[PDB]
Structures are given as structure tokens and as C-alpha cells.
Amino acid sequence: NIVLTQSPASLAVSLGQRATISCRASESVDSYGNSFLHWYQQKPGQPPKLLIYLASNLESGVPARFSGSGSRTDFTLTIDPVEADDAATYYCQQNNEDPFTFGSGTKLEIKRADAAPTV
Amino acid sequence: SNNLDSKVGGNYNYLYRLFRKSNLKPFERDISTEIYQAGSTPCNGVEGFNCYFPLQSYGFQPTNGVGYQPYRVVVLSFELLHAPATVCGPKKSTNLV
């Protein structure tokens, strides 16, 4: 049981900024040609979707703001620029070692423009 | 060959070898044609739960660029022996003198 300490826990960001989502892990490395993990986006009122698998291959359905890199053990998810679709929790999936544990989660909030309620 | 070999999701069946222990002879085929796994249990197709190929794979996607799509390359080799020539072409069309 590897507790993937994901930092930060919760942070409200605004539009046009750069959020730093770090995933701490140790296992594993060198699957077939790389040593990266999977990234996801879990919304509290919507089923999640896969952003990018193995951090080196193309996949449709993801916005272009999700990118980044990382080392063999630690990884970093960079959201730049922050749009108004980041009100969700992000995790990292261990894909090589049993049990396939996950991160702690970074609950990001959107500081968008002001809006009036419906009357 | 994007409409012939590639499919939805990417075709990762074509790979290449980084380094070979033995030396290669001219007109010799590699007998190691079986796709091995990372462990002991074979996967028989797609990868998962530590059955990866140690050889490096190519990126063959249907939405890829024109310089990265799978291209079927056929090398037309030529040789000459003590036997007379048999294969020749083309020679158009129907002349006689």
C-alpha cells in the first residue's frame, strides 16, 4: 500500500494562471519505453475522463491546457492556461505495481468572472 | 497504408530492435518472430499487467502527420547468378523489326 501523497489538497485558482499538481510516487519505472503514469480528472457531478495515458501519446477529448513532464519517480501536472472547466479533482494512477493505488487529490476551484443568478 | 494497416486507437504491432547480440548475414530472416512478454504469462494481443515488449514500438495513429503514418515499404533487390535472367520489365509495347 503506497500512499501517493498528492500536493496540494485544495486551492482556488483564477483564469490565466498556472496550477502545479504534483504526484509523489516510487513505483514503477521502464514499462516498455517510458516511466510515466496516467492522469485523470474526476468531477463531483460528472463521470471522469482520461486526460492522457503514459504522458507521451496522443488522445482526443482532452483540452490543450493539460501538459507537463516529470522525473522517474515524481510527476507534475501543469494547467496553463487555466480555463473554466477545472472544477474537479485530479489523481495519478499507478499502473505497474499491485495494489494500483491513487493520489490524495487536488480539488481545484475556478475564480471566474462575476455572474448574476437566474430570477 | 493508413486505410490498410492502421485502425482506431493506434496500431502498435510493428516494432524495431535497439541492439542485436549476433551479426546479420545478407539475405537472412530473423527466426525470433514470437512476441515475448515482460514476465512469464503471455498476454496474446494487447498489453497489461506487466507483459510489455522490451523492443520499442512505432507511433502508427490514423490522426497522425504525413511523416509518421505507417508506410508499407517494399525494397526491390536485384542480383545476378550463373543462371540466365528471368525477371525484367517493363517493355512497352508491341514493336517488331
Partner: peptide, 18 residues
């Protein structure tokens, strides 16, 4: 919590979702 189900993908990931 709100549980979800997913199928295994090609590169050992959760590609399919409901």
C-alpha cells in the same frame, strides 16, 4: 462516495467510462 465503473484500456488505463 459516488462510485464509478471503468474498463481496462490498451496501455493499462481507464479509457471507457459510463
Amino acid at each position: 462516495a459516488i462510485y464509478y465503473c471503468a474498463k481496462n484500456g490498451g496501455a493499462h488505463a481507464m479509457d471507457f467510462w459510463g
